[PDB]
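In this section we turn from sequence analysis to structure. A common task in structural bioinformatics is to predict how a protein folds when a small molecule is present, because the ligand can shape the pocket around it. The inputs are simple: the amino acid sequence and a SMILES string for the ligand, here calcium ion. Study the lines below before reading on.
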Amino acid sequence: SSTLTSDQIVVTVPQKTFIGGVYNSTTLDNLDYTPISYPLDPITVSYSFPSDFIVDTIERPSLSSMRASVFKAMRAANFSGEQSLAFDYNIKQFSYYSELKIAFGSNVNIGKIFSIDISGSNNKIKRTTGVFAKFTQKNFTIDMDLPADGNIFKNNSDLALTNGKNPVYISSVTYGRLGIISIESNASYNEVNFALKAALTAKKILEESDLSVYLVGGRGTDAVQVIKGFAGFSNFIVNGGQFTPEAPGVPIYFSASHASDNSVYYTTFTID
Amino acid sequence: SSTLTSDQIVVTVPQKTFIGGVYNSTTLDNLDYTPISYPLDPITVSYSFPSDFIVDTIERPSLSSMRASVFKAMRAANFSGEQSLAFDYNIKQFSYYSELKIAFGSNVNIGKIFSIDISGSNNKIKRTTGVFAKFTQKNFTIDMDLPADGNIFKNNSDLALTNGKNPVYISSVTYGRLGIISIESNASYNEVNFALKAALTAKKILEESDLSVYLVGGRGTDAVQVIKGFAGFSNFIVNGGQFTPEAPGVPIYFSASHASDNSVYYTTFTID
Amino acid sequence: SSTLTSDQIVVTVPQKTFIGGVYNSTTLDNLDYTPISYPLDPITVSYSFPSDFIVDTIERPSLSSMRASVFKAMRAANFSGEQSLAFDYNIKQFSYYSELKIAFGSNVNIGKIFSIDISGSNNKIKRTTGVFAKFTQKNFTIDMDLPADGNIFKNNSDLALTNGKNPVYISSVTYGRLGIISIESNASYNEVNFALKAALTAKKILEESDLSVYLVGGRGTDAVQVIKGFAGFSNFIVNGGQFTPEAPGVPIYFSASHASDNSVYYTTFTID
Amino acid sequence: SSTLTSDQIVVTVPQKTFIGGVYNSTTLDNLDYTPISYPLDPITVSYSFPSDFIVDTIERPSLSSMRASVFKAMRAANFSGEQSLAFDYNIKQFSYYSELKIAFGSNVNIGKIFSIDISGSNNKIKRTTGVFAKFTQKNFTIDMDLPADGNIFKNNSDLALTNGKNPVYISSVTYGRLGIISIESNASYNEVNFALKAALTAKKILEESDLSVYLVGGRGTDAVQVIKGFAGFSNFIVNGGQFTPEAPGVPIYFSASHASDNSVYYTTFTID
Ligand SMILES: [Ca+2]
Ligand SMILES: [Ca+2]
Ligand SMILES: [Ca+2]
Ligand SMILES: [Ca+2]
């Protein structure tokens, strides 16, 4: 029905979403992740949060190296997690599940995010109205410097070999928490949104409506209290605003570059 | 009736679901697990949780090696289990048992998960309405780095031999807790869901309905209290949110890769 | 009337259900246990519970070796029994005794589990309605690594000799507690289930109904209190949730592998 | 519908918005970022905030170098964050989403800033009236001195090579916090603005209206309290006015120069 382009791609495979990973763009749009196996020059990475250890060098770009560097940087002295990078929060209405990927911002498997069936005629909401409140807090980012020679490859000649398989290397990874409290009801949206806002900022619709809660990151003790009612979600948001070495966060978003002109990559996702 | 594809396959055989295990894809879809017996290069693994011991090397990928590495990593100093990875929770409606595998996310033996008969005309629920509340908390993951040479095999020539038997190696394993409180009743869903939500967030339908509770992982002391009523399940969820070395968790989900292009593997399960 | 296939076979002969035991599949389906007498390569075993002693090596697979290894592993330091592996609990209805083996999950001798006669026309319940509440707590498992050379035999040539007698070696053994409180009554199921649930979560039907209690494992002091009423069974479940070296548990379930392709074995049991 | 030119471009890619970065102007207007890979002379940078370490020299202009220099300058002695650089705050009305980029000041992806769809006929607001209160606090800036020889390149001859690809180097980067509390309602603007101003400076419209909150920078503890109501946003503004080394701020605005005559660059963005 529509197509959307975004530069901040959502983290669908954490095993393969690491700094310096090179992947084909068509595969990323398809939601696959096909790596381009070629040696890379040593890369330089920097951290948004202030600490005595910000600049790091990685000889071999790998997820283990990225995780170890993040751990040591956040364990370094003079580290402050009091300031975050961004905090988005919105209560919107959805009538299809395929359009719920707009909230995430890129191509996602909603059928696995929420234990539902979407294929076929089930893309429409079972109930009458579908509302959802979503929040996304970005604490810090790891960003990688552009290549000194203009090519990320170590031989500087694999670009000619990689024709047809468009190289695209991950340049940035965003760490933070995410949460959605999707609600399906048979009442009117004017009252469903009123009840949702009252519950979040403080009766029968919220008790007769279908709930679908999905949380990424954050304190587990606060996250598990969501089942206790609508105060649990607001406590999961209010608490844990400041990130600590104990609770760094889970990679939620990542940015990509074209590996040829080193420009930014815009993923494309279609919504029906 | 329908087919679904998912990248996070559910752990059906814990004995064979270990990091680096190579298995045929057709067998995994069939729910069998046929290993590809061939030497593998030493692998590098990383842990989602922050600790002084994150990066590990495994010469021979095996379940005992994975378990020992997980134990030593979680016993290492500067370990924090306060932050989890994900927390999904939903109360949905099911009218068949074969479609209950949507909640798990992959092909499962519901006939062995719940002590029922599904084969034949028994796939439909015995009672009128079937509801179920399910929760899944993912605490941490072990993820393995992509091969440096692009091939996971140690001879780099077994790929030619393994034609027809599509190699697929386990790249990630998810640790966490899972729980379902499936309920069958003769009343209306509008009241059954209301009663379930009231019991979880706080009378005759819940006492005259058929119960089916299935829990994976978590504290045993909290899990055994589920039989005491509906407060036991909510206490099993609320308590044990933060994972500790005493209670690491049971592997619930795992991701797979194609071992030829090192892309992600999407398992396929049909629902009738 | 129906046939069922399951991968988690129930422990019918504890003397012969040990890790590494090789038995014919036809015999296991028949409920016999015919060993395949052939030397085996040394095997590696791992334990689900966290302890300083997880990985063990067994030169000669035997029940005494398995028991000694389990004892020493659970007596090792840094052992935590606070987390279990699974906890299933369901209150179902049965109208035949042959179909009561669905609750166990494999072929069992119900005629010896409950001191009744099933052969002939006695397979039906004597009373009008038959209900049963069953619980199964799995604390930990011992699992054995796949053979390095792909063959479990020590000569690597006994596979050719073992044709017709399909080799099947036990790969995993599950330790835990089990319990069933089978009830036969002349009233309606809608009231029998109500009374059972009220008694378990807290009058004449439960006192005029026929009782059949079967418990495997758990604390003996709590198990013997079942005869005192319906609070004894709920106390046997609530207490002893956390397993200790004093009360490890009895092998209740075991998994098997085909010893040729090392795939998982699915036992088949028919229900009439 | 209209075109606007501004000299303070908004930070859309923090990974590529660093001091000394050279990018094509057409790409910046397109919202792409294509770097001009050429060696640069060592640059001199200065900091708006008063500290013992103000003047810095950067041999290789990179994001990691800029971040490290900012960290060390703000950690230097005799640093005062009591005085900021600017504080803009306005409550305006918007009837389209494409015109909401006027508040930011340059070309932005409103479709990713707010989880909405804009492409096609959805550019209009779903509700009747659209109001928004926005605040932007600029604490300090890093500014780079003009080249001594009049050319930023290190060979002083790459200007002839870079014809057609108009070089444009980032000269200044603004650090600060930003926030918008966009509101959609069905009432009249005369009452919606009244309610918004009363809530910010202190009932049914604000509870039945659709909320869209977007915050960049600032204290996370204060930012997460926005969900609690309208006092959270006013507390996020009132608190954290003075910037500290613990909470420096996120780059929100940057200025650019033409790299040929060293004049200021005016980006152009169209609004429909
Ligand atoms: Ca290079
Ligand atoms: Ca290899
Ligand atoms: Ca052998
Ligand atoms: Ca120059």
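The pocket of calcium ion (ligand 1) is lined by residues A 41, 147, 149, 151-154, 156 (CB under 6 Å). As an exercise, try to locate the residues that line the calcium ion site and compare them with your own expectations.
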